[PDB]
Design an enzyme around this catalytic site. Structure first.
Site, PDB file in Angstrom:
ATOM      1  N   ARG A 230      -8.236   0.191  16.188  1.00  0.00           N
ATOM      2  CA  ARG A 230      -8.410   0.817  14.883  1.00  0.00           C
ATOM      3  C   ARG A 230      -9.670   0.332  14.176  1.00  0.00           C
ATOM      4  O   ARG A 230     -10.693   1.016  14.177  1.00  0.00           O
ATOM      5  CB  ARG A 230      -7.180   0.528  14.012  1.00  0.00           C
ATOM      6  CG  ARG A 230      -7.046   1.420  12.798  1.00  0.00           C
ATOM      7  CD  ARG A 230      -5.648   1.348  12.239  1.00  0.00           C
ATOM      8  NE  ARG A 230      -5.309  -0.014  11.845  1.00  0.00           N
ATOM      9  CZ  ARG A 230      -4.110  -0.387  11.413  1.00  0.00           C
ATOM     10  NH1 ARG A 230      -3.126   0.508  11.322  1.00  0.00           N
ATOM     11  NH2 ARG A 230      -3.898  -1.651  11.062  1.00  0.00           N
TER      12      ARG A 230
ATOM     13  N   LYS B  99       0.855  -1.190   0.000  1.00  0.00           N
ATOM     14  CA  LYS B  99       0.000   0.000   0.000  1.00  0.00           C
ATOM     15  C   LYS B  99       0.892   1.242   0.000  1.00  0.00           C
ATOM     16  O   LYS B  99       2.092   1.145   0.214  1.00  0.00           O
ATOM     17  CB  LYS B  99      -0.900   0.028   1.235  1.00  0.00           C
ATOM     18  CG  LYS B  99      -0.163  -0.092   2.556  1.00  0.00           C
ATOM     19  CD  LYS B  99      -1.119  -0.448   3.673  1.00  0.00           C
ATOM     20  CE  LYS B  99      -0.377  -0.929   4.897  1.00  0.00           C
ATOM     21  NZ  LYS B  99      -0.163   0.161   5.886  1.00  0.00           N
TER      22      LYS B  99
ATOM     23  N   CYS C 111      14.477  25.172   0.836  1.00  0.00           N
ATOM     24  CA  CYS C 111      13.450  25.778  -0.011  1.00  0.00           C
ATOM     25  C   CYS C 111      12.540  24.713  -0.616  1.00  0.00           C
ATOM     26  O   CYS C 111      12.789  23.524  -0.488  1.00  0.00           O
ATOM     27  CB  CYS C 111      14.096  26.618  -1.123  1.00  0.00           C
ATOM     28  SG  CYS C 111      15.092  28.037  -0.535  1.00  0.00           S
ATOM     29  N   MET C 112      11.480  25.149  -1.274  1.00  0.00           N
ATOM     30  CA  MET C 112      10.532  24.222  -1.858  1.00  0.00           C
ATOM     31  C   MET C 112      11.163  23.259  -2.838  1.00  0.00           C
ATOM     32  O   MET C 112      10.807  22.087  -2.851  1.00  0.00           O
ATOM     33  CB  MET C 112       9.404  24.972  -2.559  1.00  0.00           C
ATOM     34  CG  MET C 112       8.273  24.074  -3.025  1.00  0.00           C
ATOM     35  SD  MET C 112       6.934  24.977  -3.844  1.00  0.00           S
ATOM     36  CE  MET C 112       5.980  25.561  -2.440  1.00  0.00           C
ATOM     37  N   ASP C 113      12.115  23.740  -3.637  1.00  0.00           N
ATOM     38  CA  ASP C 113      12.751  22.897  -4.648  1.00  0.00           C
ATOM     39  C   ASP C 113      14.265  22.812  -4.593  1.00  0.00           C
ATOM     40  O   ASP C 113      14.864  22.073  -5.378  1.00  0.00           O
ATOM     41  CB  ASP C 113      12.365  23.377  -6.045  1.00  0.00           C
ATOM     42  CG  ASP C 113      10.966  23.909  -6.109  1.00  0.00           C
ATOM     43  OD1 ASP C 113      10.019  23.099  -6.089  1.00  0.00           O
ATOM     44  OD2 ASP C 113      10.808  25.141  -6.190  1.00  0.00           O
TER      45      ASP C 113
ATOM     46  N   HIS D  73      -4.613  -7.405  14.157  1.00  0.00           N
ATOM     47  CA  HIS D  73      -3.355  -6.691  13.968  1.00  0.00           C
ATOM     48  C   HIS D  73      -2.822  -6.307  15.340  1.00  0.00           C
ATOM     49  O   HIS D  73      -3.590  -5.952  16.241  1.00  0.00           O
ATOM     50  CB  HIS D  73      -3.570  -5.441  13.112  1.00  0.00           C
ATOM     51  CG  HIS D  73      -2.299  -4.769  12.697  1.00  0.00           C
ATOM     52  ND1 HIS D  73      -1.340  -5.398  11.933  1.00  0.00           N
ATOM     53  CD2 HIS D  73      -1.822  -3.526  12.954  1.00  0.00           C
ATOM     54  CE1 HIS D  73      -0.325  -4.574  11.739  1.00  0.00           C
ATOM     55  NE2 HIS D  73      -0.592  -3.433  12.348  1.00  0.00           N
TER      56      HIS D  73
ATOM     57  N   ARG E 127       1.525 -11.057   6.964  1.00  0.00           N
ATOM     58  CA  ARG E 127       1.461  -9.853   6.151  1.00  0.00           C
ATOM     59  C   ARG E 127       2.813  -9.136   6.296  1.00  0.00           C
ATOM     60  O   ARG E 127       3.083  -8.460   7.291  1.00  0.00           O
ATOM     61  CB  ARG E 127       0.282  -8.998   6.625  1.00  0.00           C
ATOM     62  CG  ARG E 127      -1.047  -9.769   6.619  1.00  0.00           C
ATOM     63  CD  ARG E 127      -2.257  -8.870   6.840  1.00  0.00           C
ATOM     64  NE  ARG E 127      -2.193  -8.149   8.116  1.00  0.00           N
ATOM     65  CZ  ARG E 127      -2.517  -8.664   9.305  1.00  0.00           C
ATOM     66  NH1 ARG E 127      -2.933  -9.897   9.429  1.00  0.00           N
ATOM     67  NH2 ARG E 127      -2.431  -7.946  10.394  1.00  0.00           N
TER      68      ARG E 127
ATOM     69  N   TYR F 207      16.265  31.894   2.852  1.00  0.00           N
ATOM     70  CA  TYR F 207      15.172  32.605   3.502  1.00  0.00           C
ATOM     71  C   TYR F 207      15.470  33.028   4.930  1.00  0.00           C
ATOM     72  O   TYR F 207      16.044  32.264   5.700  1.00  0.00           O
ATOM     73  CB  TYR F 207      13.904  31.747   3.468  1.00  0.00           C
ATOM     74  CG  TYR F 207      13.280  31.710   2.100  1.00  0.00           C
ATOM     75  CD1 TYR F 207      13.147  30.516   1.403  1.00  0.00           C
ATOM     76  CD2 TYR F 207      12.875  32.887   1.472  1.00  0.00           C
ATOM     77  CE1 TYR F 207      12.627  30.495   0.110  1.00  0.00           C
ATOM     78  CE2 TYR F 207      12.354  32.878   0.181  1.00  0.00           C
ATOM     79  CZ  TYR F 207      12.237  31.681  -0.494  1.00  0.00           C
ATOM     80  OH  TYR F 207      11.730  31.679  -1.774  1.00  0.00           O
TER      81      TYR F 207
HETATM   82  C1  PP3 Z   1      12.495  32.503  -8.003  1.00  0.00           C
HETATM   83  C2  PP3 Z   1      11.174  32.480  -7.301  1.00  0.00           C
HETATM   84  N1  PP3 Z   1      10.220  33.328  -7.746  1.00  0.00           N
HETATM   85  C3  PP3 Z   1       8.991  33.349  -7.115  1.00  0.00           C
HETATM   86  C4  PP3 Z   1       8.674  32.558  -5.978  1.00  0.00           C
HETATM   87  C5  PP3 Z   1       7.281  32.688  -5.387  1.00  0.00           C
HETATM   88  O1  PP3 Z   1       7.333  33.047  -4.022  1.00  0.00           O
HETATM   89  P1  PP3 Z   1       6.020  33.248  -3.227  1.00  0.00           P
HETATM   90  O2  PP3 Z   1       5.219  31.983  -3.262  1.00  0.00           O
HETATM   91  O3  PP3 Z   1       6.385  33.599  -1.813  1.00  0.00           O
HETATM   92  O4  PP3 Z   1       5.210  34.332  -3.829  1.00  0.00           O
HETATM   93  C6  PP3 Z   1       9.762  31.707  -5.465  1.00  0.00           C
HETATM   94  C7  PP3 Z   1       9.887  30.991  -4.114  1.00  0.00           C
HETATM   95  N2  PP3 Z   1       9.001  29.918  -3.734  1.00  0.00           N
HETATM   96  C8  PP3 Z   1       9.244  29.234  -2.438  1.00  0.00           C
HETATM   97  C9  PP3 Z   1       8.135  28.152  -2.233  1.00  0.00           C
HETATM   98  C10 PP3 Z   1      10.596  28.424  -2.374  1.00  0.00           C
HETATM   99  O5  PP3 Z   1      11.373  28.271  -3.272  1.00  0.00           O
HETATM  100  O6  PP3 Z   1      10.813  27.855  -1.174  1.00  0.00           O
HETATM  101  C11 PP3 Z   1      10.947  31.599  -6.231  1.00  0.00           C
HETATM  102  O7  PP3 Z   1      11.898  30.639  -5.920  1.00  0.00           O
HETATM  103  C1  PP3 Z   2      -3.550  -4.569   8.819  1.00  0.00           C
HETATM  104  C2  PP3 Z   2      -2.076  -4.414   8.556  1.00  0.00           C
HETATM  105  N1  PP3 Z   2      -1.376  -5.528   8.214  1.00  0.00           N
HETATM  106  C3  PP3 Z   2      -0.015  -5.421   7.978  1.00  0.00           C
HETATM  107  C4  PP3 Z   2       0.729  -4.212   8.126  1.00  0.00           C
HETATM  108  C5  PP3 Z   2       2.232  -4.239   7.829  1.00  0.00           C
HETATM  109  O1  PP3 Z   2       2.986  -3.831   8.961  1.00  0.00           O
HETATM  110  P1  PP3 Z   2       4.529  -3.771   8.905  1.00  0.00           P
HETATM  111  O2  PP3 Z   2       4.978  -2.836   7.833  1.00  0.00           O
HETATM  112  O3  PP3 Z   2       5.014  -3.286  10.224  1.00  0.00           O
HETATM  113  O4  PP3 Z   2       5.085  -5.135   8.618  1.00  0.00           O
HETATM  114  C6  PP3 Z   2      -0.042  -3.047   8.595  1.00  0.00           C
HETATM  115  C7  PP3 Z   2       0.467  -1.732   9.188  1.00  0.00           C
HETATM  116  N2  PP3 Z   2       1.200  -0.778   8.391  1.00  0.00           N
HETATM  117  C8  PP3 Z   2       1.607   0.512   9.026  1.00  0.00           C
HETATM  118  C9  PP3 Z   2       2.425   1.333   7.981  1.00  0.00           C
HETATM  119  C10 PP3 Z   2       0.413   1.481   9.439  1.00  0.00           C
HETATM  120  O5  PP3 Z   2      -0.743   1.290   9.282  1.00  0.00           O
HETATM  121  O6  PP3 Z   2       0.834   2.620  10.005  1.00  0.00           O
HETATM  122  C11 PP3 Z   2      -1.462  -3.151   8.652  1.00  0.00           C
HETATM  123  O7  PP3 Z   2      -2.253  -2.018   8.806  1.00  0.00           O
END
Ligand code: PP3
Ligand code: PP3
Lengths: 382, 382
Positions: free
Chosen positions: B135, B38, B310-312, B165, B218, B264
């Protein structure tokens, strides 16, 4: 598109329209609006926001890297698009063909592209100047002139613009902001000729000093109805309309007896006979574990999340026995109560920008326009 | 699939194969292995891990909700799939037609489904019993017997299995685990007949008490080479192989003079003449802002991330002048150094499960099998 889990985000496109239109009114007739729709439009849906923004008054779009620009093209967007980040020289031809402007800040990158590309399509570049952000951009005059020379030399390379970016335009104190702006003005002199497009403002800068924007602003966060910062919230020219909201439904309801435990680690214990509800949303949907002590809205009332959040589900304490299928709002409003992205951002100890982006591909986006559902976007849809 | 940004995750499918195969050897010839894929296989790629798992010894698959199962079918997976979460009664016919087993835990749901579906395809149900996780699942015998009766009554409803579970199978102390297991044995007596498939174990339980697994386990987190918890790490039967790694490349390199700020808020200041590098990965890619004081690997050495993420993009302090294009490893190994998902989880103050799931759709996944690149999966690919 259709979805088979009772968990979805809603995007109000009328709000986005209003947020951009109000800015168009605010800015001088000759100032362009480039809507920033990178990161799938800050988690709101790239092509849906892009279309609305252009409808409201924007004329160009901006994304982070090449892939995002091509996706908009494939999806039918014809407006000009600028890639704000880096790209590979070997990809200049592809950008040229799809009509995508590129950011440039190194002369060695241009040296490489010149050897690889030779027409017939022209490549429009935007010279990036670092005035104090420390991210991308040219720093010295020698390098700047070298870039311009290589561009001038190639018959298909065109310098369409030049810009910079501010690091603190969202702080009440403008000391650094003023230093960057001044530095920008001084660096512009290094250019033999001013390109047709000079830009520097983001949402905070353009909303605060609309007269210091030149011919184009890059509108991002504010377009989605979110304040660049809590600090400048009270300094904004017009009220911003929030467009994002998140919902789910109760898929199970039960009563616990005192002493019964809930979720992983059995960290929560029922102190008395209480009603516990289960909702189909977890950290794989962007509802991070750290939100463990937060709350949600149900039947117009706050309901605390109890125990650890799971990958796809989490439990909440209910006012009493509610029917399965009852709607729960994680971000949005119910009756007299409301939970904003800023609230969630506070709890996660981060900024509002990060929240909509983290709501994953797993959560479908339902779009509204003119008070009616427009379309449904399910990333993993059939 | 191809990508145009020097940022990508790598998934070693041979590690996934070994992790499952070692379990196949560990379990009795009659015990089935149900691979849990999943959430896009905990961020590793659903169909790629599902195929490898089946190849290594698993015979069935498990997902969180209907959409995830239908996506596997569309992608060509023909093995049995069980939906572990909730679903809509109105969607029973669709699950039946695609041959998807559903979890059931309420009699009212079945009352609703009976009135909607009437053949010709049979629907296989797996009865969920809540033994202390709080759950999903039935709790009392009256409700259990009602569920069985409605199923028996309908000519197309078939009770293929039943399970529970565990909330604490990954804790060294087995007090609660023992209580849940004992409660399970007592609740099984409420069934007039034992279904052909009885299951209860997750990774931790199956790796710790393989003899107490019944006929199906599982297998989730451990399949990806991650320990259910740091506590039981030393109790595992065989060494797990980590399969996920994340990389990027320097897109810009520059030298800063003392006093120059970065990113920033200008929260970072160069104390001396230092080399700063910029990499194309940010919080919209799952590299959350909270990782600001973490470090990455470059040229076989740790390099601190400086200033806000930053975002990217984000910046790091380099050992010296490195060429642009130099590879940076965020999760993985370089020379004698290594950064594991466990290291990142510690810094973000979360569990390893959450880390690969947060690495967004923006990041392409490159697959390896037999020491060779198999395929490339770019979510936003052309
Ligand atoms: C070059 C540039 N121009 C414009 C924006 C738009 O900024 P605002 O959303 O604040 O108007 C960003 C920064 N963006 C942020 C998300 C970053 O890079 O973390 C940017 O990197
Ligand atoms: C019903 C059930 N079976 C099996 C698993 C697999 O568990 P493990 O990854 O630990 O072997 C999960 C939980 N999964 C976790 C990610 C949850 O619900 O947060 C589950 O929800």
């Amino acid at each position: 598109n259709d979805f088979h889990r009772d968990t979805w985000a809603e995007v109000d496109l009328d709000a986005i329209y209003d947020n951009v239109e109000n800015l168009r009114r605010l800015l001088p007739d000759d100032t362009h609006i480039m809507a920033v729709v990178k990161a799938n439009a800050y988690g709101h849906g790239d092509v849906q926001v892009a279309r609305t923004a252009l409808e409201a008054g924007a004329s160009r779009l901006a994304v982070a890297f090449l892939d995002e620009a091509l996706a908009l093209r494939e999806k039918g967007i014809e407006a000009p698009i600028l890639v704000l980040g880096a790209s590979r020289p070997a990809d200049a031809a592809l950008a040229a063909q799809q009509r995508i402007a590129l950011t440039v800040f190194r002369s060695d990158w241009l040296e490489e592209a010149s050897a690889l590309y030779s027409g017939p399509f022209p490549i429009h570049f935007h010279l990036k100047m670092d005035t104090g952000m420390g991210r991308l951009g040219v720093k010295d005059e020698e390098e700047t002139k070298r870039i311009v020379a290589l561009i001038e030399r190639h018959p298909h390379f065109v310098l369409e613009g030049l810009y910079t970016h501010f690091a603190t335009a969202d702080e009440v104190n403008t000391d650094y902001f003023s230093y960057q702006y001044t530095r920008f003005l001084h660096m512009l002199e290094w250019l033999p000729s001013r390109p047709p497009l000079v830009h520097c403002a983001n949402s905070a800068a353009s909303l605060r000093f609309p007269d210091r924007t030149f011919n184009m602003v890059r509108f991002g966060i504010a377009m989605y109805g979110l304040a660049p910062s809590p600090g400048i919230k009270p300094l904004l020219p017009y009220p911003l309309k929030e467009a994002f909201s998140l919902h789910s439904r109760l898929v199970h309801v039960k009563k616990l007896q005192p002493g019964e435990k809930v979720s992983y680690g059995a960290t929560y214990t029922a102190q008395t006979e209480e009603w516990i509800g289960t909702i189909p949303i977890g950290y794989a949907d962007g509802w991070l574990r750290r939100l463990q002590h937060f709350h949600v809205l149900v039947d117009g009332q706050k309901a605390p999340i109890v125990g650890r959040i799971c990958m796809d589900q989490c439990m909440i304490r209910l006012p009493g026995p509610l029917p399965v299928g009852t709607k729960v709002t994680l971000i949005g409003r119910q009756g007299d109560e409301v939970i904003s992205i800023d609230d969630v951002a506070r709890h996660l100890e981060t900024i509002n920008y990060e929240v909509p982006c983290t709501i994953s591909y797993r959560v479908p986006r339902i779009f509204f326009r003119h008070k009616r559902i427009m379309e449904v976007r399910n990333a993993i849809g059939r």
